Amino acid sequence: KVFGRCELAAAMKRHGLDNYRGYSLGNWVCAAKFESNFNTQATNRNTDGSTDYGILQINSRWWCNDGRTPGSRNLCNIPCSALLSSDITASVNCAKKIVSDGNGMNAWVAWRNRCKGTDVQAWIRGCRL
Numbered sequence: 201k202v203f204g205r206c207e208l209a210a211a212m213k214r215h216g217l218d219n220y221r222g223y224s225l226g227n228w229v230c231a232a233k234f235e236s237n238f239n240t241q242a243t244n245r246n247t248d249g250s251t252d253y254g255i256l257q258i259n260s261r262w263w264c265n266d267g268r269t270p271g272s273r274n275l276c277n278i279p280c281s282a283l284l285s286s287d288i289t290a291s292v293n294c295a296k297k298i299v300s301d302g303n304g305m306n307a308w309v310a311w312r313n314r315c316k317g318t319d320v321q322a323w324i325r326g327c328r329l
């Protein structure tokens with residue numbers, strides 16, 4: 201599923217991401233835009249052999265099991281394929297664990313490089329929330 205910008209914002213809000221650990225909703229929408237272009241089916245392979253999955257590009261090195269990243273962890277206790285669903289519940293629940301691990305949203309490279317320190321509220325502007 202390719203979400204619309206406001207559609208995703210409302211889904212994220214419903215799942216408890218607005219101001220989760222101090223990160224306003226705009227931060228999450230901006231991250232999803234630059235990580236996956238709002239596409240739940242996005243995958244990208246990393247140099248170390250791990251793969252990033254889904255709308256928030258969660259990495260199989262630490263967070264999910266894809267059966268092909270030897271010596272990796274599965275801290276979210278889920279198959280990586282679950283992160284590709286049109287239902288974003290699994291991605292959100294795992295993202296909540298990631299953002300709580302001490303490094304905040306800096307875990308997401310595109311957030312650090314393209315959202316951090318910008319006017320992120322622009323990403324939810326005009327949305328019925």
Ligand SMILES: [Cl-]
Binds near residue numbers: 221222304305
């Ligand atoms: Cl933080």
